[PDB]
Design a protein around this motif. Sequence first.
Motif: not given
Lengths: 485, 486, 485
Positions: B27, B126, B418, B427, B432, B467, C98-99, C101, C138, C141, C145, C148-149, C151, C264, C267
């Motif tokens: 990014w 996984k 990502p 972003l 981080q 952050g 602080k953000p 994780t 899954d 996960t 994403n 952070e993106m 979206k 954030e 976000l």
Amino acid sequence: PSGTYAGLPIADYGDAPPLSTKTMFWRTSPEKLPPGAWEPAYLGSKDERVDGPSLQQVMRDQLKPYSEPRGLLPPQEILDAVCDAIENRLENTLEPQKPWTFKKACESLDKNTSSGYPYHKQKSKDWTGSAFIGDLGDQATHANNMYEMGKSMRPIYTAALKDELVKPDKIYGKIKKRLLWGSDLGTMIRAARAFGPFCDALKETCIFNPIRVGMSMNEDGPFIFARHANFRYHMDADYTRWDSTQQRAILKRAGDIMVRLSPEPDLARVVMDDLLAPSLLDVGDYKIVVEEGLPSGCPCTTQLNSLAHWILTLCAMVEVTRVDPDIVMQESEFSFYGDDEVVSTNLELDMVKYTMALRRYGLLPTRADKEEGPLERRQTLQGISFLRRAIVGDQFGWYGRLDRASIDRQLLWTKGPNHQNPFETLPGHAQRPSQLMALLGEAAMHGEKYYRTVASRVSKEAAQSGIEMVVPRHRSVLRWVRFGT
Amino acid sequence: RPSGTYAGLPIADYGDAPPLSTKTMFWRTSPEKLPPGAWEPAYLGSKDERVDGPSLQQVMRDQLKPYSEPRGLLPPQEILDAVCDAIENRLENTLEPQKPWTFKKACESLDKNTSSGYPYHKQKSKDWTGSAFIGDLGDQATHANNMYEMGKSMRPIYTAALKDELVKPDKIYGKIKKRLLWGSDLGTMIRAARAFGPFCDALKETCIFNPIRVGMSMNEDGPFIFARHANFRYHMDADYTRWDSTQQRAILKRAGDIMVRLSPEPDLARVVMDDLLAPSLLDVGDYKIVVEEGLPSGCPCTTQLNSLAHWILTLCAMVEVTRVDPDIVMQESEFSFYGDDEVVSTNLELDMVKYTMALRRYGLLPTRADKEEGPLERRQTLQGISFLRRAIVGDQFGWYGRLDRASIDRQLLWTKGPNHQNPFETLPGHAQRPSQLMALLGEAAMHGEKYYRTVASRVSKEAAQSGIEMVVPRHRSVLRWVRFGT
Amino acid sequence: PSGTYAGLPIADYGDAPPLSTKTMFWRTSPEKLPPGAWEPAYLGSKDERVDGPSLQQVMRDQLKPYSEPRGLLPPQEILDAVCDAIENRLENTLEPQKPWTFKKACESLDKNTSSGYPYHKQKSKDWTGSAFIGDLGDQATHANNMYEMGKSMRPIYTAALKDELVKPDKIYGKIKKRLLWGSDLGTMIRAARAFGPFCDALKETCIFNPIRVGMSMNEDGPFIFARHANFRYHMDADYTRWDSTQQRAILKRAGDIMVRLSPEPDLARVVMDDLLAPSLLDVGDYKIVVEEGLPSGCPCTTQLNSLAHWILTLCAMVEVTRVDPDIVMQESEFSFYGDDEVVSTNLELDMVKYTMALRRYGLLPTRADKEEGPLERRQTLQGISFLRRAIVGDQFGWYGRLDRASIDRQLLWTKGPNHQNPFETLPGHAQRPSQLMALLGEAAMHGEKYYRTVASRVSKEAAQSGIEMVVPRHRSVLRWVRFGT
């Protein structure tokens, strides 16, 4: 379907996977195996060594006893007295325990063995390293809800055939292989929780009371053996087909005790009433009903079976001598491990009538070393074995020693992954050392000459394996072996 | 079965591989314009809104050309024999015999964020409990482990990928080039990690005294390593095109020969080593092709085995040309290898014309650094040669590795995140980047006050919207921290 | 598909598994429950306490008020005045975080509770004491994403009915049973990341700021209630159907504040904007669309909800008192936990106008703890309650004491495995050491006499029981609860 299979009723179709055809044992040299050398059991059609019957057949022969007519109970009046003594004795000796949580029930289970019905998964497959997930997490999950709700679950046992070393006769003669009873995971976790507390206690007590399970041979042998030694008359018995001769009636009595002396009696009553109810055994073609003999898959299984051995031994002893069971217990010392016994006593005991009394309970003792009854009884604790070690006494005290042939056999073979032909040799077996040392130990106890014989065979391997081995001096092991540490 | 060809190579079977990725991790850090001639992430296929180009599948075909090119020539048999023994002795003397790796330790050694490959093509974390593999990756590993102990053989299936990385603009907008990645089957991943982990560990430990620098820290071991090279008169960086694909299984075996013999389980390691080098099976979407040659770069061992070959190929050339026995060359030279990356330092008076030939003759492809043309040049300074993509620099305080300013600048223009479809997408604060951000200062401060101050420009701003906030250090203050640590 | 379920649009097919026909509650004595005794809520067509409508139907009943015309917005001029004031106060109190994780967010989640859409697995089924693997893995996960993106993702809430004890009427009269929204793990962790820092900030200022979420009744009680006592007038304000009657417009106002105090924010904006967008709810056969009311699944929501509460109340007061909200809030101490409130104030508040305002907003206060209003206020802090505890005005300070009738229950019922008939007895329970203690200490604060009748019940509830425990003296335990630690 219905249904006489191997002398026993049919109830349903089998969900059993077909009997294991491969073995875990591997010859360590390629040398011409000494004549009369024990060998991995029959393997099936695939077994190149011989041309024996189906494994399916072998299993039938093994089911035979479980439909042979049961013997008689001990005289009800005496039985009552013994159960109560054994109870009273334990009450006084056993320390009340905390109940076992689902966690510790699942923690306790051997994750290397099979889940059994119906997933027949190796348990590790579904284990997080804390709790059970997926398929087995859910079977366990439900088995726990049911246990907590004091509700009932028919257990399903999966039969198997023990892969072990046997005399050549069992192979190239009349083929015999020994039957197993693979419990299901649901049942296991239920009995785990149910009687895991009680069992625990019993192991902590295993020197003071006659059920020996959990006993360290080296660490506890001297004392336990010195204890038997205080007593005037020693004897062995060598029950053959102990398991399949048990009366469920007696088992109920052992269970009666186990429940009473477990922290969740209300809920144990169920699992035990479950565990003893006409048992379902999946032999592959069918699940069948076995109403009698020992149902032997469960954690607590071996303790309950020991508990019956006690009951049965006393029942005869008391009948014969005609002395109050607790008295006999203070004029006697007992060691029990499933079918495995050593009975010591100061009471003058009639060996004819004793033999007669048991064979009447339907047991099949024999003369431990000359194969014939009445059971002799010697003035010498030496020459009986316990846990396939022989009782021995020198000027230092008593100890259980493993004999020559067994240590011979332990060098000739080693565990490994599953394979179909047992003379094959795997590469340089790394888990040799920790054991190989013990072998070094156990041979010291036969003195110098023999110990040299092993000292070398040990050198031979271990060099061309991991690192090098220190081969300590004969007298230097004897001290590590007998005294310590 | 099949066969057939794809990309000029026999077709062995149908492909199970998933489709190739069309996204990137880079990014843009800031919403401004990108300076002219700026590096950008590699081509994303069909869907790259940057340019019209072929299917990624096609870029693959391009990348696969070299594995069907005729191999160069084996180095004169005698010298080969001679050099392998000399390299075996060095290692025999320098490696603390390690003890056999267990199932558990091998499983532990796997990078759990990479794919498991064929069959399940699953991210490894996984089926990972924290210590073991359960479910699917459980079965495959537990099976893969048994085959090992028993000395039975498996056929490794590799899966193709294209390296996502910043490339010089020209590889996007001119002729498109994106590098081929091999990805081993968890089967082989675990199997080859028992057999060879002890060795890789050993070698790893021994990396300041051995030319195979896999496992080195550029901060800690750099000074020592480099000051070690400088004891030798002449220096060459003599750098290779298409290294991996030029490799000769014939030599790769000799490389393997050494590691097996040097492993705590030779008997077992051999079965695994034969398996790797066997004409390889690469899953490339539509097919699995037979790759007879080059390097099979899947497994853990691989990069050590790869460097080991590079050792064997450099030594052969030197011995072939100078005609000094391989123990004397090696006692007269300091070597540094890492896969294809190499510094070669020696007092011996080597003929560079004569040298390059031998190399090319072995079918290698050395070019005059990124300066173009030769014969390869030799120099009497070490300054200017680089290694692990840092400039080898020497000052009053000793030798060190210094990631150059152009290289620093890009890191300011791109940050990892990502997978996504547009590289120019920005972003949020991305909470981080303090770890990464700090290093940049360090890297910069080794370029004197002028520069560091203008890196103090950017590392400042990009700290506002983030952050947490800390104050920017003094130059001399951070340079010390950077040079002697920690 | 299309297009109306209990007054509300259909959007898709549901994937929610059926409703629980079972309870987790179990009786402690078989004795016939006293007259007018609370019992677990209705369990449908298989329930045996009555024949009544389908749970499906009961839920439709619960969904009625989501479609009701929303109430009105506070005056624009008063709305911003407050909101800007509330944020400035937080800004002057909250320690910047602080953000959070993925690692942290994945840890926060109540692991013992359904995954929601679409696997509907209890979270524990897939966790490693460490992270989510397999299915949820899954899912976890992907959502991270999308975080952070920056979206967007459409939450898919699952609907349920709370298993709880209710007033017997609510079984034998007009059957009611409370609706719950199950969030999906994606929204779960996503909101956890976005808004976890804020909630944490709230946690560690729950005595100084009216939002008491995360508080300890025992440790923090005595000082929250002490602050309240510092003010002349106090009021219950008791709300009917809070969550249903909510206005997204205000939920967006509290959303805005929350997002403004997040590490954030950009976000966080997204996550909020999703949370607040017309909620998709999975009601079994169909997914429907809930545009209004509070969507309650995820983390956050309870602080979100209290934050809205804070606004609504502060509005009415400024509306009525005419005073700048800074002064109000400085002549007042508030306590919000969701819909549970307590408002203490020095300002003479026109109770008629004030109530009116709230109703106008479309709220539904009942009478404090009696019938009919105008809402009323007292001069004394005793009589008010909060978090189901009666605030008590003691010489040692102020506290929360759980009422007599509430105790009687916790002794009448025990939580266990899920079963069909609430009336069964949980066969010889184990887990009570902590729970028994607390209720023994709860009863401590009700005097010496009440403690005796409790002690005895505790003890025959310690009859068939896991631990043979002491009844400590009253004086002793009363010391234990009040003062700590």
